[PDB]
Write a protein that binds this DNA or RNA. Sequence first.
DNA 1: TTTTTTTTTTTTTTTTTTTTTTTTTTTTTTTTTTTTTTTTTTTTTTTTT
Length: 48
Amino acid sequence: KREQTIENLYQLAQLTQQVQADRIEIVLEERRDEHFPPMSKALMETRS
DNA sequence: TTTTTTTTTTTTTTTTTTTTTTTTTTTTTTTTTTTTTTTTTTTTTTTTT
């Protein structure tokens, strides 16, 4: 009588792999299109 | 006697770091109002003269 239980767990898993893909899309929107902010030639003297 | 190119003066503009002030939010704070236990007052009955 675990039919309900397991199929319902798969139904959460099925609607939630959608959430995983949604997070991946959130990344794609958030993917940088940019790099690490550069140095100012004085932070060069400071840290380098 | 003339011309060309480069190394020095100075001048202009931008970014990063570090200057101040105000507002919003959070913390300590007595007055007023509300809640509970209580010592004084009121009522009735029984017994005795």
